[PDB]
Structures are given as C-alpha cells and as structure tokens.
C-alpha cells in the first residue's frame, strides 16, 4: 500500500509526450523491424540476393519516400542492424526518420522460447542487460521500443501459464524501458491461426488484455507513457464463417473498451494475415465504430505498408520511384483509415 515512485513528473512528461507524437491524429507506425532472416525471405520472394547492401537499400527506399508520408508516419520501428545503417547521402537512418517528423523505435526482444509443460506455447526472452541496451539505444536516437509476445488459440491454449507469464514479461520490459526514457509498446499478439470464430477471439482478447493491464499495474507501469499493439479481433484463418468489417470493428472496439484503461495513449494494430486493403478497411471500420473510443486507434503495419512496394521494387534500382509510390499509397490509405475517413511449545511459533 506504499508508493515508491518509479518516475518523476519530468520522466512522465517525457514519456507521455513521445507516446502522443507517435499516435498523433492521422499518424501510425511503419514496422520496418524484420530480423535479418525474415528480410532474407522478403528478398528471396522478389528474386533478390540477401546482402547487407540490398537490406540497406530496401530500408532506404521506405525511409526516403517523399514528403506525402510525413503526416502519415508518426513512428518507424527498426531492427538493431538498421538503427546503425546510413542512407546513400551519408545520413544515419534515425536522422532520415526524424527529419520527416517520425519518432524512431527499436525492437528490443530476443525472440520467443518454449514454455515447458504446455502445448507448444511460448514466452519471450530479452530482459538481460535490457536497461543498458535501452540507455544506449536512447543515445543512438530511439525513443520507443517493441517487445513481441505470442499467444495461440487452440483446444487448451492460451493456458493460465502462458497468459500469466507473457503478461509478466511484458510488464518487466515496460518497466525497464520507462526507466530509460523509452516508450514501451506492449505487444500481446494473439495469432489468427486456427478455425475459431469471432466470438472466441473476442473472449481470448478480453482475458489476455485484462491479464496484461493487471501485470502493468503490479509492476507500477505508467500507462500514459505506453502504447498497446494487439491483433484486431477477427475469426481464425481456417474459420468458414464470413464476417463484415463492421462486425470485426464492433468485436475489436468492444474487447478494448472492456479491458484497456483510458490512460493508455494509443492502440497501434497489427494486421495479422490481412491484405494491405483489408488492413486499411478494417482500421477504418474500427475508427467509424459508434462507441466511445478514449485512445488513438491506429496502425503498426509491416507487410500491410510494404507488400506492393517490395513487389514493385523487385530488387531493381530503376523501380525506386514506382516502389515508393506503392508505399506512399498505403501510408495515405492508413492515415485516412486511422481517422475513419478511408474510402477505397512449538505452538509459540
């Protein structure tokens, strides 16, 4: 019942101001934080060699798209290697992001690890030396972070263990970020894998998010200096029932209204298995939902911002402008969608 304040008013202001910039009206996040292995797969799919140079050029292509993206992009999240790369003109990539009005983010987790005695469930590692890593990343230009937890809907899953453990590790990560002037994005990703319906996903989302916020309270997390990164509430990928975008919007907004305190600055959605267009249409329907929404409801999109741009590039420097156009189109669509404006004795002891 005793306060030992984690943060001063100055630290709170600093974190809250950063969180608000990222999710400011009309803005969302470009998730450009694929690991070297994931991005190798991206390059392979377009017949391009996985060299550091091709990775660097591909990231330059996204980061140096013209000024039409500036009102669209509040934040750009990077993987470790990219934080230390440079554009052709010699500017560090963080400087490229900042000059276009973007906040720089860093993915800080060290991947999922199996939870013994579960049906293929995971937790996430990456807490070791995280404080010193955060302090260094702050100095190197990052103001927000991402830590990804993964949960799966199945017959016995997510188990009581997987929920408790993933919510706890998210709170530990968030606590360390906030000590270093870094806004933690809290990402409890519930996979769309399986044949479960919309109602089941809504139920699981409600239970997972109630555990997340209880853990954040237990660990003294300052919610105003945080963002939330969930999946939308959708049927599973193998579900045969069809749903309108308005039903997805209603299930999503209802689940968030029941669990997410209004102090949380913003919700930056994953797009799961959605196409670029579907991701934008669903985000738009969420923002049009006729229920009170006391937080920003926006995007943190990777593939949903990048898929057409990656294809149009095709590893060809000649296709730079055509590839950037595809990315600009998605940034413009999503910027409108996050505003609801998108139209495609031993007894003494």
């Amino acid at each position: 019942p005793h306060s030992h304040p984690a943060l001063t008013p100055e630290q709170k202001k600093e974190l809250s101001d950063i969180a608000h910039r990222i999710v400011a009206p009309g803005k969302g996040i470009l998730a450009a934080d694929e690991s070297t292995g994931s991005i190798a797969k991206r390059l392979q799919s377009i017949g391009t060699e996985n060299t550091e140079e091709n990775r660097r050029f591909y990231r330059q292509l996204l980061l140096t798209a013209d000024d039409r993206v500036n009102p669209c992009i509040g934040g750009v999240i990077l993987f470790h290697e990219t934080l230390y790369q440079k554009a052709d003109d010699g500017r560090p990539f963080p400087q490229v992001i900042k000059s276009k009005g973007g906040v720089v983010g860093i993915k800080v987790d060290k991947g999922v690890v199996p939870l013994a005695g579960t049906n293929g469930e995971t937790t996430t590692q990456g807490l070791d030396g995280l404080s010193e890593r955060c302090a260094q990343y702050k100095k190197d230009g990052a103001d927000f972070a991402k830590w990804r937890c993964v949960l799966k809907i199945g017959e016995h899953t997510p188990s009581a263990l997987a929920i408790m453990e993933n919510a706890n590790v998210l709170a530990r990560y968030a606590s360390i970020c906030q000590q270093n002037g870094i806004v933690p994005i809290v990402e409890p990703e519930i996979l769309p894998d399986g044949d479960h319906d919309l109602k089941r996903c809504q139920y699981v989302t409600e239970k997972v998010l109630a555990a997340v916020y209880k853990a954040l309270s237990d660990h003294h997390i300052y919610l105003e200096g945080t963002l939330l990164k969930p999946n939308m509430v959708t049927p599973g990928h193998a579900c045969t029932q069809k749903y309108s975008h308005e039903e997805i919007a209603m299930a999503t907004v209802t689940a968030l209204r029941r669990t997410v305190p209004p102090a949380v600055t913003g919700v930056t959605f994953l797009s799961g298995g959605q196409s670029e267009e579907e991701a934008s249409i669903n985000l738009n329907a969420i923002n049009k939902c006729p229920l009170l929404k006391p937080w920003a409801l926006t995007f943190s999109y990777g593939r949903a911002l990048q898929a057409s741009a990656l294809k149009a590039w095709g590893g060809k420097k000649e296709n730079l402008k055509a590839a950037q156009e595809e990315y600009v189109k998605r940034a413009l669509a999503n910027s409108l969608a996050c505003q609801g404006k998108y139209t495609p004795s031993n007894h003494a002891y």
């Binding site: 694929e34 292995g37 994931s38 993964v150 797009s271 990777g302």
Partner: peptide, 7 residues
C-alpha cells in the same frame, strides 16, 4: 520465420 509476412 516471420508471422506478419508468412501468413
């Protein structure tokens, strides 16, 4: 493996 890019 990547969940966002691999379905």
């Amino acid at each position: 493996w990547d969940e966002d890019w691999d379905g």
